Amino acid sequence: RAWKQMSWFYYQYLLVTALYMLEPWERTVFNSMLVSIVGMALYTGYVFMPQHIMAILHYFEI
Amino acid sequence: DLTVKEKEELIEEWQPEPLVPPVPKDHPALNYNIVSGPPSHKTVVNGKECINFASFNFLGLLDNPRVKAAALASLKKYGVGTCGPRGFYGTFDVHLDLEDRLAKFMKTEEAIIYSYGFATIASAIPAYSKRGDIVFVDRAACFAIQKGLQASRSDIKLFKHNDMADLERLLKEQEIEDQKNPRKARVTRRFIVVEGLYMNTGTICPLPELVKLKYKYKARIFLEESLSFGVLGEHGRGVTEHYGINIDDIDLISANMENALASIGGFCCGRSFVIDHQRLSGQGYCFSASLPPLLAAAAIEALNIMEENPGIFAVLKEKCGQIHKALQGISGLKVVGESLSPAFHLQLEESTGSREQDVRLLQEIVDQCMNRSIALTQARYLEKEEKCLPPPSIRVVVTVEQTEEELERAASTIKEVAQAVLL
């Protein structure tokens, strides 16, 4: 049942970001750019931002 | 500035004009002709039986039993109303079949259907021409073309009727203006809006010279073929059929299905590159309901009848020639038009000073003819609105239905009546 939930979440992502309209290669281009930017932000956060905030967030989630 | 007291008394004092000015009692257009029945050949006008020389029904397809049966079958299938625009559940299969039939009939890639004969050209012109463009339109063009040119805000430059030296002069002057400012010249579009057979005058345009001018001065061409669509050429494809001009040269060809095909509507045909823009930028298309199915089916059946035998065009041509030849020699009137033209005009040779007296003379002639069983009509114009107002004139319309004897009687009746009244 979790797979149906995740497919629905992806469908909502497509509806919100207007990727529903676009052809599959355009979707792949957008997703690649998004994950590249996410990785860049993660690396920059690792270089400078303290991990203490991450530990606090993990404790709050747990 | 102004006090509240001053503004209140200003609002109190103001008295606006009446909504509509008073109309004189003796206005000819105020009285309407009541046709008791269909406006067919041998009709009844004002209670008097008359032979119809006034209605634009060239091929006699108005009361053809095949056309009526086709329209009745379509009415039984769909009904009378479309109940929506072409965008919103108002596109039927008959509309697509009719568009395809017109595209195949005119040897053209695409055609588009408007639901009213005025709106087709009055919405075709504003779509392609915007503010800042140059338009070279003929002096003697119908009201629909003028309103289409007014709806767009381009620059309109009239030229003399069927004068190609004057179009050369205008296009050369615009060439100099282009040389002065190349930056604007690169973004200014030139159009030439002409008509195949002119309703006002009754003459025909010189397409060969117009096409050479298009290819010399890079100015596109729009053609209106209201009268010449179903009457000119061997297979009745218009004036491009008449001259032999390749239809690809003409960029847009607009006509109305109301004269020859005898069903309400209009259409515009051209390449897909040109036509497809009208489906979104055509106001008469996007913002109005579609053609009722029965009218579209009647148009399709009329197209079938025209395609089955093209001899009716030849018989119409010979009838026009014969009546035009017989109408020559009136003592007080003169014929304005060409032999090949179905609908031409009779105008006074020596016109009195006032236009109202000329209209009164022509209407007395029309009434005296109508008492003798010939239903003539007089061309009706808006005096104030028209850019170039033609002289008052009686309209003569010829049909494949009117036999030779009826044409001879009409000619002799007009001769007697005009020579009596002008005496």
Binding site: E26 | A29, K68, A71, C83, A119, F143, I264, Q283, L294
Partner: protein
């Protein structure tokens, strides 16, 4: 301006998050449109577009690229929701020809199959006079057999028939005005008869959300045009005061006339005009009123006479009453009603009366029979039942959708129900998801409506029965859960 019965309307505002996501979606589409345009220009990808012929390459380009930007990159992606062909009478249930595309909506191929029994909510038959059987159809068939289809000349010359006179006097008795005139097209009615009434030196106070025909009619005449906010009567009063006090723009001369262009029901918004306040203002400031009643002439009022009967007012107060037969009576046409002098002036000085062809004789008989049915001439009780059923349908549908959690615009009595989607992808998604479940709806977007407010408009009818409405409500509820379309913070 006094309302004898309450005037309850609601226009709930766009939530902040939904507006932000709408802007993000439009931005993504804009960037990918720029990318596709760049690829197409450099021929890296083949173009499914027509090109100007090689003999016309050195001509000035007919279309400026930026002009068609919205159409190629945004409208084309969801073009399948519009121009859907039908092959049946547009009753409660319609037959849609099935079509498919293999190059992403650039060209459509018709598959053999036909979708049967589609619940229809895009057609305008409020009173359910769109049927292929009935007394209207028999009368139209008889007139088609006798008079033929289409007339071949203008009204002034030979195209004036006895049917036209019968229809005009019938309309005059219908509305309650002294005289009326009929035209072959409502768009033509507006665009040809607004320029006759006013000219240069007259002011036209137009609504914000007026139809394209009214705007075109105002543009064709030389009158100065000013715009007031949609049903903001304080704004109308301010513009009236300023126009009367100051005068013409360059030379501060008084105006010749002031004409107020309004509508009965605004189709997109679904809001009924505040007519009593407009009449109070026009009586206080000596203005003229042009009331367009395309959507309200059949739907609204206890006996289907329009807004002037819905509010209980007097038809003599309104100077010009335009109207269209396409919506309710089921036949194409248009009309203007007013006093005798106005109608005589229009009969003499109207563009369509001089240059345009009359109505078709088969259509005028359908109109005549529909009107005689509505106002009780036929002897049957179809006129009362149709209006009562339409009112009940409107109440039921609007109540049920509002208590599901959707955002609905407009007055609670208007039969047009605009549901709000707010997002560009959901415009296509809603249409496709509805059609999969055998409901046809009209989704409109950026050109007809503002950029943020995207809506699906349901046009209810007296043809829809309670079972059709219940089925439609179930399917709309399920699709709303699917697409997360319940943006209402008030009720659920």
């Amino acid at each position: 301006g006094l309302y004898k019965r309450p005037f309850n309307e609601a226009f709930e505002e766009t939530p902040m998050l939904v507006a932000v996501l709408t802007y993000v979606g439009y931005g993504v589409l804009t960037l990918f449109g720029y990318l596709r345009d760049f690829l197409r220009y450099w021929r890296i990808e083949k173009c499914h577009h027509a090109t100007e012929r090689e003999e016309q390459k050195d001509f000035v380009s007919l279309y400026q690229d930026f002009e068609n930007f919205y159409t190629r990159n945004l409208y084309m992606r969801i073009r399948d929701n519009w121009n859907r062909p039908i092959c049946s009478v547009p009753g409660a249930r319609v037959d849609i020809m099935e079509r498919q595309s293999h190059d992403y909506n650039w060209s459509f191929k018709y598959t053999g199959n036909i979708i049967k029994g589609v619940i229809n909510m895009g057609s305008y038959n409020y009173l359910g006079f769109a049927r292929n059987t009935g007394s209207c159809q028999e009368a139209a068939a008889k007139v088609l057999e006798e008079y033929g289809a289409g007339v071949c000349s203008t009204r002034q010359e030979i195209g004036n028939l006895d049917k036209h006179e019968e229809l005009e006097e019938l309309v005059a008795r219908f509305l309650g005005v002294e005289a009326a005139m009929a035209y072959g097209m409502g768009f033509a009615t507006n665009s040809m008869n607004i320029p006759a009434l006013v000219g240069k030196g007259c002011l036209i106070l137009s609504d914000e959300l007026n139809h394209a025909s009214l705007v075109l009619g105002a543009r064709l005449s030389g009158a100065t045009i000013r715009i007031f906010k949609h049903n903001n009567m304080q704004s109308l009063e301010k513009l009236l005061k300023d126009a009367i006090v100051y005068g013409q723009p360059r030379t501060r001369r008084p105006w010749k006339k002031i004409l107020i262009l309004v509508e009965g029901i605004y189709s997109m918004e679904g809001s009924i005009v505040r007519l009593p306040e407009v009449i109070a203002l026009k009586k206080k400031y000596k203005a003229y009123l042009y009331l367009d009643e395309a959507h309200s002439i059949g739907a609204l009022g206890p006996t289907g006479r329009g807004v002037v009967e819905y509010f209980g007012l007097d038809p003599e107060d309104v100077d010009v009453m335009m109207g269209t037969f396409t919506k309710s009576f089921g036949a194409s046409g248009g009309y203007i009603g007013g006093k005798k002098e106005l109608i005589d002036y229009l009969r003499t000085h109207s563009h369509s009366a001089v240059y345009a062809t009359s109505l078709s004789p088969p259509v005028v008989e359908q109109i005549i029979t529909s009107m005689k049915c509505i106002m009780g001439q036929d002897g049957t009780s179809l006129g009362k039942e149709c209006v009562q059923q339409l009112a009940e349908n409107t109440r039921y549908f609007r109540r049920r959708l509002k208590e599901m959690g959707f955002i609905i615009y407009g007055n609670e009595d208007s039969p047009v129900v605009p549901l709000m989607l707010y997002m560009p992808a959901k415009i296509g998604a809603f249409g496709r998801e509805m059609l999969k479940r055998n409901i046809g709806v009209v989704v409109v977007g950026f050109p007809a409506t503002p950029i943020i407010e995207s809506r699906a408009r349901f046009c209810l009818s007296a043809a829809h029965t309670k079972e059709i409405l219940d089925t439609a409500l179930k399917e709309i509820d399920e699709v709303g859960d699917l697409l997360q379309l319940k943006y209402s913070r008030h009720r659920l």
